[PDB]
Amino acid sequence: SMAEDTGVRVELAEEDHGRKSTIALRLWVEDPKKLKGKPKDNGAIEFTFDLEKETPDEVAQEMIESGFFHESDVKIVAKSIRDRVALIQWRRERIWPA
């Protein structure tokens, strides 16, 4: 589905140089009214994401298993990661090459 403002932000922690399989990301809650479970506010959740081996759904599920979000918000977390990773991959394939 089209990218949207889900209430959950996912953004780069540093520039993507395109040379490695991993990128460094940060996730935080921008609008808690859009979540069924209201999390503790301990700041951004940092994480490295492997573009070759990992999916947005697996990382979202690991965040549920770690207690960061309510299980009824898993689809919102997964979509927020997916929207950001799709932009990173577009740039690697369609902009970054000479």
From Swiss-Prot:
Record's subcellular location: Cytoplasm; Cell membrane
PTM comment text: Autophosphorylated.
Tissue: Expressed in various cancer cell lines (at protein level). Predominantly expressed in heart, brain, skeletal muscle and colon.
Stretch forming the signal peptide: none
Superkingdom in the source lineage: Eukaryota
Known partners and oligomeric status: Forms a complex with the phosphorylated form of STK39.
Main function: Serine/threonine-protein kinase component of the WNK2-SPAK/OSR1 kinase cascade, which plays an important role in the regulation of electrolyte homeostasis, cell signaling, survival, and proliferation. The WNK2-SPAK/OSR1 kinase cascade is composed of WNK2, which mediates phosphorylation and activation of downstream kinases OXSR1/OSR1 and STK39/SPAK. Following activation, OXSR1/OSR1 and STK39/SPAK catalyze phosphorylation of ion cotransporters, regulating their activity.
Similarity field: Belongs to the protein kinase superfamily. Ser/Thr protein kinase family. WNK subfamily.
Protein name per the record: Serine/threonine-protein kinase WNK2
Record organism: Homo sapiens (Human)
Species classification: Eukaryota, Metazoa, Chordata, Craniata, Vertebrata
Region of the whole protein represented: 454 to 549 of 2297
